[PDB]
């Protein structure tokens, strides 16, 4: 992965968006 703003943070954001969506 590219650590764009630290990949972990992007993954967290994604995961939270999924948490809201699902």
Joined tokens for residue 5:
């703003």
CA–CA distance from 4 to each of 9, 21, 22 (Å)?
A: 9, 24, 26
Experimental method: NMR
Joined tokens for residue 7:
């990949």
1-22 burial, b at 16+ Cβ within 10 Å, e below that, comes to eeeeeeeeeeeeeeeeeeeeee
Instruction: List gaps in the chain by the residue before each (C–N > 2.5 Å).
Output: none
Q: 22: helix, coil or strand?
A: coil
Q: Are 1 and 7 in contact (CB under 8 A)?
A: yes
Cα 8 to its chain centre, rounded Å, is 7
Angle at 6 between CA 11 and CA 8, to 5 degrees: 30
């Amino acid at each position: 992965f590219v650590p764009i703003f630290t990949y972990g943070e992007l993954q967290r954001m994604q995961e939270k968006e999924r948490n809201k969506g699902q």
